[model samples]
Target: YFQSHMMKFTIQKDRLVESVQDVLKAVSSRTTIPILTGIKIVASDDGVSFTGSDSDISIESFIPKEEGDKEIVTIEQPGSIVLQARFFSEIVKKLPMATVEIEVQNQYLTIIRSGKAEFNLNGLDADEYPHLPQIEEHHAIQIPTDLLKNLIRQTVFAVSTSETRPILTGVNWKVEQSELLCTATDSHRLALRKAKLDIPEDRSYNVVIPGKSLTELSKILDDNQELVDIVITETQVLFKAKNVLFFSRLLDGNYPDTTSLIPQDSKTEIIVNTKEFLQAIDRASLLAREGNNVVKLSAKPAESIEISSNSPEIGKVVEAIVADQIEGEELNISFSPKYMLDALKVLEGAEIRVSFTGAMRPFLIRTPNDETIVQLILPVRTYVDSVEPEVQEMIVPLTFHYSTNEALIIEQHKQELESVGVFLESFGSNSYIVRCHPAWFPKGEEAELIEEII
Candidate 1:
């Protein structure tokens, strides 16, 4: 027979209630580990701590013995146990008294009492729960909590939702010298934000953090002006606030190099009010949604820019947006309205500067005088009017590594690919001939692009 020890404690209901709810955000009902479905509580002379984790992200909330002039908790006997999160959180919130008493009779058996209401709940040994990550303190940076929250808000929304390219699902963070840059993209669009950090010496870090984790952390953090210390390690990053600890697993793999994606020269430039431009795009999107959700921009020197969308079944809409200034070559371009709207909403200034490399190349939007943030959008090729005669005359031979027995698969998707500017014909049993490629397809990346379409 095994012997178990007894432990008991009493805590103010309000403090315990808040702690339970704060940590509960980390608990997941779909967790594979049974112990992870519960909230781990540890009481000591200093204070009481409540922890919740789902392996990928973990959060811990601490209540001190006397914080800001209040006796929040009183521990009669120190002990630890894992209580079911779903039940424990509900029970603590509905307790009929100001203080709640918890007692452990035989390690796993627990009892909760408040006023005349009492309940018996089954718990697990706290030792069985996996330990939270222990990140090194050698490399730590302190940032204001509110600023961190703002950074997360501005960048995390642009992260890719598709798992096909797992790296894009996270925000790439790079710290070089005394500046920090955060970038996120979904291939079709990109968002980049940069800020300078106050530190003792130059230090560098390049890591990708899951966007889902950052969004959750933003929700839990209060909008206070207090500073939060961030400690970075090889595999984990720890965020230490006043009485809270947030841990997130670093994503593995190198983020794709995006330096070449941003254009260096511009063929057209337009300056306009951010709000007015956003509203124009919003209205244009109504008609655009009927089509392929694309809106065309026609810019002429010393004239109001034309924003229009056309749908054969529906009607067409044209909005002449008066610009503050329009210069460079005459331009006509089409792009996704939603992508442009998403980028405009995050910009922090009244006026915005828009630059275009060409009609078919990617364009950029940023604040008029500030370069801290840049938003990029790839233009949609409306037609094959610019296809070179030589390239159109040449036929590229390509081979696919799939079985010929799946000929039906090729036939089914052949028309779909053709509609998107990929012209392929069956050459051999398992080989295909590429007669033409899309004008937007980058040179030297033909094979990779073909493989993706197939």
Candidate 2:
């Protein structure tokens, strides 16, 4: 205890730089407490730990005495001190040699040296640093790093950026019975995912962590299969991974239960061409943005789903493209073009199924092949003060190539609706359905039907 007045340590240059940089993210100069602007460093015979905190979040990084039998940090006299967060980290990063010498003299003044360069940085007594959360007694749950990252990436973007609804600014994580449910919503849209976690059945936690904190944590997490042990206490959640600890304060408000917003029954079911649909919406939104990014989708009974928009004196754009298959009730819907843009970008796979209840209800978009991720968009109510919604029909001809199976299918379907039936011909080789302006009939089937078209 007599040597407590002086501290000297030698650490690997790369290890010191990396640990300091990791904690730097949580360091904020704009804070109520001046000492919070500094990073707390503690050296011991076991290893060394660096911590930076702004109260909202705290990040701590550790360097061991050795890794895989290589010396990382060596200390002659164990001690602790707090240094300027940004300046000290920067100096360590630019050091000239592979090893750095750090010494703390009387009155908390510290010196750092590497090769021919040296830095004298003002420091604070380690006792002045704020105490990190004491959650060592809490039960920790384990989750893969990459899995957490994937969940955050899918939900973080949907959180509300406005402060009016503080609860919406966070991503709600509800863990129960080894299942993890992550959800995010911004009032207009919502994203939810449920994953089966390998945790003890007795452990459960429900917390709303700020979207910003989750984003920062994701940036620090590496893309690997290693598991991160998480301790979710009443007020804070701690994530512990490879030589790093991330602590975030949970928001102090009740998160909205967003599960009810996702509709169970869809009035209209559509397997849309994800590529063509996104491109069409993208192009149409160029003009739609002038008016609240409004884009209207009108169902074309026998053709493509038309996406139309008006820029109010700038111009009007309407693009029609064929969907893979549109079934159930006819569609007449309007939604925020920006919401759809984000929704479509996140959903993967070639063909996507979009289900809608009505013009004013929430709709879901999912990959046709995978159902794990669901994106819900709430449509906007647009008052049409100008004119009645009508389609400007353009007369175009279409031909249908019918194979034997196709002909047989149509023949069976036509039997139900005799009027719209394939006014089919009797010829055997090739079967065709021809459509021109006023009439649509079979072209290559029979002589009797051929005369009927004439």
TM-score of each: 0.82, 0.78
- lDDT score for candidate 1 against the true structure: 0.81
- The parts of candidate 1 lying over 4 Å away from their true place are 1-7, 95-98, 105-107, 114-116, 288-292, 384-453
Q: RMSD to native for every prediction?
A: 6.0, 19.4
lDDT of each: 0.81, 0.77
- Per-residue lDDT of model 2, residues 104-145, tens digit only: 877848999899987898879999999988886458888899
Tens digits of lDDT, candidate 1, 1-454? 2544455789999989888888898998998998999999988888889999999999999989788877877788877889999999999989999999999877458999899998999878988988988776787898898889878887887877656557778999999888888988764677788877888546899999999888888877899889889887888888889778989999999887764577768999999989999999888889643314668899999999999987667888899989999999999988778778988888878899999977777799998878788888776765546432112212114456476666667766777766666767776566676745543355335667778878
